[PDB]
Amino acid sequence: AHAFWSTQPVPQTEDETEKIVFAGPMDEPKTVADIPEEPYPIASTFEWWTPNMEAADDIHAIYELLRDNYVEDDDSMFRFNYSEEFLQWALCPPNYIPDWHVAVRRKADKKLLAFIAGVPVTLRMGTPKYMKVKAQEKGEGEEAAKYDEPRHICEINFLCVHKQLREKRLAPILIKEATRRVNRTNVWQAVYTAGVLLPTPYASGQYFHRSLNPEKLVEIRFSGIPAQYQKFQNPMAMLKRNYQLPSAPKNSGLREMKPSDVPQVRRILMNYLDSFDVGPVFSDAEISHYLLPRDGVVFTYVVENDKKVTDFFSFYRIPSTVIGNSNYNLLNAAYVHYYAATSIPLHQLILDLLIVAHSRGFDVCNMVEILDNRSFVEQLKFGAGDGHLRYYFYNWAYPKIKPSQVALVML
């Protein structure tokens, strides 16, 4: 069934997943010296290329591949259009490894055919709370605790093969070369997500959407007018009214995050994320990188009253190309990023996210039911979509956990 995935160190079935009781590696311990020094073999008409994702022109080359060949829906209505500024932000965090950005070009004329990217992340990925209780009940605490310490691993994203090269087994080659480059730096696990089901997720969550511009969403067929609104003389007027938001934030002391806020935002974020089984650990440099505002890319606000930051939220922008509409070329989506609330209920904090996103011309707010995202779904009028986001590890056995025990946002 899976000619490539069956050869890899990942749990092969749900049944296998059911028997996993402790976090730990799947594979034998290996050393850098055991890993081939030479790139993985590739057809003589192709070549490996490492783009410089801080150099405008290489960023643009990768941007065009993704613009034209990255994730699209099954009805080919929308295709993600991650911006050049977003890609530099996502792929070049503190201490990133340029070698983990891997491309294939056709040698002749240098057409770009494929990409995959890894970035470092420090992840808590030790045995989850409910399985540590089971271990305690059996006298197996030491085994369960072995990998409690946060680990420096690889996060993989942006796997893409050109549409003309699909179903030729190029993605496994990209994956094998990425793995080799990661292993050559003495890193042996990765974390990744996908909308598709592969062997075998450790967690899965539904996607949720919150309409900000329903007229546009219906025009481009992201949304339709729900059946219940047909009982009204003006269905669309009633739909617009249902999703109306304030024109300015409601929380006193909301303002954009600045450099001086990094220590307090790090503190409140890390205290919050500790509550979840799987989550990132961020240094001050990483809090700076992932949360300070970047035009067009990431938007972060703090609540500060009386000289103290007590809460914050962040969202990031991913537009999609709208394939063939005469009124609109783009869907402008805002995705819920990290947040922490200590002074107000989460729904009150995230309402301001929706208000700011709407004010800035976003059409929809998206999120997965990770973190405490379920706590404000109903009041804030999110609805489940048809997608799921599945969380995977490479070379890591891990008990199944609920998505409300995951605190890693994947871009």
Ligand SMILES: CCCCCCCCCCCCCC(=O)SCCNC(=O)CCNC(=O)[C@H](O)C(C)(C)COP(=O)(O)OP(=O)(O)OC[C@H]1O[C@@H](n2cnc3c(N)ncnc32)[C@H](O)[C@@H]1OP(=O)(O)O
């Ligand atoms: C220690 C360090 C380790 C680092 C590596 C960790 C692993 C990272 C793994 C990557 C995580 C990426 C996270 C993201 O970026 S998820 C985003 C993925 N990108 C897209 O969906 C963009 C649009 N589609 C494409 O570009 C192509 O269809 C892709 C490239 C997805 C496959 O190309 P193509 O359609 O031309 O197929 P093939 O003939 O070359 O290959 C077929 C094989 O590929 C397996 N396949 C299909 N889709 C995915 C998928 N999303 N993750 C993993 N495997 C996938 C499939 O089951 C089959 O294997 P098997 O069933 O036969 O066994």
Ligand SMILES: CN(C)CCCN(C)c1nc(N(C)CCC#N)c2sccc2n1
């Ligand atoms: C790797 N990485 C995490 C990027 C996420 C891709 N983004 C932004 C995304 N992806 C969705 N799906 C793949 C659902 C597929 C299924 N089942 C959806 S569905 C609604 C928004 C949305 N956005």
Ligand SMILES: [Mg+2]
């Ligand atoms: Mg292929």
